[PDB]
Design a binder for these strands. Structure first.
Lengths: 64, 67
DNA sequence: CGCGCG
DNA sequence: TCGCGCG
């Protein structure tokens, strides 16, 4: 199973599981926030833990 | 008969005076010299002053100068 | 405008 | 590549 330190990481993961790959502004807005900056530190931390991947060209995030 | 340049903020006048006497210098140096902590404390102001042609930045050294 | 950086 | 100025 994926290991989440904060429940909000699961919220991101499930959003991407449910809706396919999306940019950080979409993850943020879907979860009640505004911009990529509201979630990017979480996304890159999750990427470092092989929870998510990002396509560097489209900037879309997806589950790992 | 007013002095030149005119600065809209004390911060801008302080940056300009620091660079006139010491410059060029990196943003991290300017931030510390004005009692702040990192480049993030002055970058918004430096690029705004650059857009008004009050300062320039050397791309190679990253040091800011009075224009 | 990508920015992940405390 | 800590470059980053971004609201």
């Amino acid at each position: 199973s994926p290991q989440f330190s904060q429940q909000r990481e699961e919220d991101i993961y499930r959003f991407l599981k449910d809706n396919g790959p999306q940019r950080a502004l979409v993850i943020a807005q879907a979860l009640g926030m505004r911009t990529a900056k509201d979630v990017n530190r979480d996304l890159y931390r999750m990427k470092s833990r092989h929870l998510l991947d990002m396509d560097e060209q489209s900037k879309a995030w997806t589950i790992y």
